[PDB]
């Protein structure tokens, strides 16, 4: 069984320890300070009561839009075929679906991370941008921006709803 748990000051050191092993990118103290303030947008992932993963998100107001930014999402390498990634993603997509007012969900990923690209493609995410030297020192340093459109038409019925045509 997979369980998601809250990120508190009691277990933030555990999230940092998992993040430090899963990702080659060093996150600073301000990153872990912000995670303690996003509520349900940050979760620890548990498999048979053992912490093997985490998802950290924030609300972003870039591009004159209401966006959900997935900062980090991942599991320890031996636990990537246990549906923990799906549980974590369906959790953040639920916070968004319930909200109804988000324009999109987006994240950065190295261009060579095919397992993550293909995973996100299952939930409707597409490559919308490629950023040269988005990361420092790691190879490849080039990142794809993966985005899922969350915009739902506002209007009580068909005649007042603006959508694709």
């Amino acid at each position: 069984r997979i369980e998601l748990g809250d990120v508190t000051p009691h277990n933030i050191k555990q999230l940092k320890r998992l993040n430090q092993v899963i990702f080659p990118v060093s996150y600073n103290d301000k990153f872990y300070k912000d995670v303690l303030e996003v509520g349900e947008l940050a979760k620890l992932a548990y498999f048979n009561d053992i912490a093997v993963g985490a998802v950290c998100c924030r609300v972003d107001h870039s591009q004159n839009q209401k966006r959900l930014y997935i900062m980090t999402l991942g599991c320890l390498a031996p636990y990537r075929r246990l549906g923990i990634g799906t549980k974590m993603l369906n959790h953040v997509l639920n916070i968004c679906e319930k909200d109804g007012t988000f324009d999109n969900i987006y994240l950065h990923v190295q261009i060579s991370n095919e397992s993550a690209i293909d995973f996100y493609r299952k939930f409707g995410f597409e490559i919308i941008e490629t950023k040269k030297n988005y990361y420092k020192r790691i190879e490849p340093a080039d990142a794809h921006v993966l985005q899922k459109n969350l915009k739902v038409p506002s209007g009580q019925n068909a005649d007042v709803q603006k959508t694709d045509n």
């Binding site: 990702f23 990118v25 990153f31 950065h108 990142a143």
Partner: peptide, 4 residues
Amino acid sequence: MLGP
């Protein structure tokens, strides 16, 4: 994975 937030960068850089």
